[PDB]
Write a protein that binds this ligand. Structure first.
Ligand SMILES: CC(C)(COP(=O)(O)OP(=O)(O)OC[C@H]1O[C@@H](n2cnc3c(N)ncnc32)[C@H](O)[C@@H]1O)[C@@H](O)C(=O)NCCC(=O)NCCS
Ligand SMILES: CC(C)(COP(=O)(O)OP(=O)(O)OC[C@H]1O[C@@H](n2cnc3c(N)ncnc32)[C@H](O)[C@@H]1O)[C@@H](O)C(=O)NCCC(=O)NCCS
Ligand SMILES: [Zn+2]
Ligand SMILES: [Zn+2]
Ligand SMILES: [Zn+2]
Ligand SMILES: [Zn+2]
Lengths: 374, 374
């Protein structure tokens, strides 16, 4: 009975910087031409959402944030072809228009229709579908998943297997696919290779999972917090190392450990230093280092281009280099064929209403991933 | 009549830093086990040789320098298999032992037996084959081509077509193959792509030649010296641009010129800034920038890793990523099949004795490439 009209619901609104989320009553306008509207069933709490809170990921406020989710379609706008009423779905914070330079390219995925580079906090048409007390509220990354209902453009949503556990596959919306993809799509880890992951939060662990998926003989986890190590070895990390145990700087140890450098390194932290370390520790002639994480601060690093001239490759990606609308339904299909498990990434589950609690568990470094449910 | 014994000849000896080369009489010891000895017919004057002179490429002195050459084998040591007496050859400043981690790898070429990283200025065995007045003199990059006679290890020499004009194919020893290879092996330039070359000396021109060889629709030459432009368009550059004509910084102009960024950029200069420019000006999602040239100074650059995170790739190479002993005889074969011309790269020819004159023509930026002949 909701199709074609306004829905009154609860959302999590960030009125301004450095404040908690307030649960407010919200009006969600119905989907216009080429727009879908979705009943959220589960959303993950990711780092970038916290960066919205500190003001270090600059997007316009007030905003309904949140970008890692799954749910079910409530209705569709005119001429929507890719999804139907009731289809389970995952919003795509990196779109796939299928028509830009980037979408047409065989390697690229950072669709030119993205809202990441200079965020507008709107739908593709320049307007908002959310009001609170008549005050309009911005979208976030064309997703905005901190709400019982959202509306997104067709190029920001993917149909998925009608039977997927939405509490679990929502991780394919961001944290999993960002890490997994960094290893299997971007870096193209190969049989028997030696990998080295920097940062053992959930993206890092998904990287490790991507490195094991490829046939890596050695997967060296690096982190300053000991407590992250069990889980990493559980997911495939053959070895772990904590830089603060050592006298020598860690690329020096990782180089002698790997007999003159690793095949593939991954920076999954988001300090500046650690990116340089990771590049240096790969084999001088043919090593590949991948930037997964970055600080949102956006600052400049210092580095010796001698490291590249010997033959090293330094690259990075968003959303694990995955073309979003092609990839997500196959990535979920791969979960249902049991070609990897998601449980290890899910440490805390909460009702949507204790969103603020979940964000306390990320800031204290206790959560790998909190899931909010509806 | 020279096989198995000492040869008295002329060489160009650098007794110390920041002095001209002196023509001295030299004793060249005969080849030991697995060593070749070569009568030079032509050597090129490259930048790195001048960097030896200023003390900015640190190798031990005194030294017979020079690394871009061809010649003819005078004799061979025991158990040498790859070459015979009288075979025309090109010394390889980057070896191919065929046995290290790097040589065994399918992408790598920076053989671990190289003398580039921490130069010893010797043969592979740790000794010198050159004396002047009984004072021993170091080798350079296991080549030392500023001499009527040299001796190199078997893994630093390549047999070539018995009919090649040695005045011309010597360029495959360094400057040509460094540029050409950067485009066709390293970067893997593709059909119809948009290329952008920074620096239009002879390596840069060889890059341009490598970009035209691949099927590039657009090849944008960049240089601060107007006078380099005719030659670049001659070799395939479809367009040229001089940053000092403009108000906007050049990646900003190159970005609007290329409709949002080039497919492949190449830094072939060796300042720090220009490497960053070149990376920035390639397309954010799928662009590839290649470091060919570097300053020998070895300093640190400043850079925003946001540029990589969007999907950019930043890599570099020595000797155009070419596996030296496999590549040189096929690269020369490709010259004799007339699949590219070398004449455009050769601006000045001189007798070996006016070596100092040729080095004056590089420092004043008048030479693209001076060839010394014997
Ligand atoms: C860092 C990213 C990848 C999230 O990763 P993750 O969820 O694993 O964050 P988390 O902090 O939990 O994990 C990083 C790990 O680094 C460790 N760490 C912190 N400092 C150090 C250090 N000096 N040395 C080693 N490890 C460290 C922490 O212990 C932690 O385990 C994310 O913030 C990011 O930068 N993504 C970039 C891509 C992007 O912007 N996409 C848009 C949607 S997110
Ligand atoms: C620079 C290298 C590649 C030699 O190239 P080349 O012979 O073309 O040198 P050359 O100076 O003639 O050419 C560079 C060009 O840059 C131009 N240039 C100088 N400054 C600028 C600037 N600010 N902007 C644009 N162009 C510039 C010059 O006009 C010149 O034409 C070489 O020095 C090098 O760094 N090689 C690294 C690999 C290596 O060490 N291998 C070992 C054997 S050499
Ligand atoms: Zn697109
Ligand atoms: Zn995320
Ligand atoms: Zn080798
Ligand atoms: Zn050279």
């Amino acid at each position: 009975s909701t199709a074609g009209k306004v829905i009154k619901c609860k959302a999590a609104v960030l009125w301004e910087e450095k404040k908690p989320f307030s649960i407010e009553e919200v009006e969600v306008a119905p989907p216009k031409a080429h727009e879908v509207r979705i009943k959220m069933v589960a959303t993950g709490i990711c780092r970038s959402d916290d960066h919205v809170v500190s003001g270090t990921l600059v997007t316009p406020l007030p905003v309904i944030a949140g970008h890692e989710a799954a749910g079910i379609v409530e209705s569709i706008g005119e001429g929507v072809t890719t999804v139907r009423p009731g289809d389970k779905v995952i919003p795509l914070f990196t779109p796939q228009c299928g028509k830009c330079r980037v979408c047409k390219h065989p390697e690229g995925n950072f669709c030119l229709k993205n809202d990441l580079s200079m965020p507008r906090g709107t739908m593709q048409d320049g307007t908002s579908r959310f009001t609170c007390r008549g005050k309009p509220i911005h979208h976030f990354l064309g997703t905005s998943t901190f709400s019982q209902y959202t509306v997104v453009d067709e190029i920001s949503v993917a149909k998925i297997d009608a039977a997927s556990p939405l509490e679990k596959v929502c991780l394919i919306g961001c944290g999993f696919s960002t890490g997994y993809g960094s290893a299997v799509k971007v870096a193209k880890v190969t049989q028997g290779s030696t990998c080295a992951v920097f940062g053992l939060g959930g993206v890092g662990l998904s990287v490790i999972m991507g490195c094991k998926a490829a046939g890596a003989a050695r997967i060296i986890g690096v982190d300053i917090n000991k407590d992250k190590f069990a889980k990493a070895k559980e997911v495939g990390a053959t070895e772990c190392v904590n830089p603060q145990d050592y006298k020598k700087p860690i690329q020096e140890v990782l180089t002698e450990m790997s007999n003159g450098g690793v095949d593939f390194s991954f920076n999954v932290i988001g300090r500046l230093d650690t990116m340089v370390t990771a590049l240096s520790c790969c084999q001088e002639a043919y090593g590949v280092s991948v930037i997964v994480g970055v600080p949102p601060d956006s600052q400049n690093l210092s580095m010796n281009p001698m490291l590249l001239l010997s033959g090293r490759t330094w690259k990075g990606a968003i959303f694990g280099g995955f073309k979003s609308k092609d990839s997500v339904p196959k990535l979920v299909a791969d979960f249902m064929a049991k070609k990897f498990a998601l449980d290890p990434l899910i440490t805390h589950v909460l009702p949507f209403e204790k969103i603020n609690e979940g964000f306390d568990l990320l800031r204290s470094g206790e959560s790998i991933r909190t899931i909010l449910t509806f």
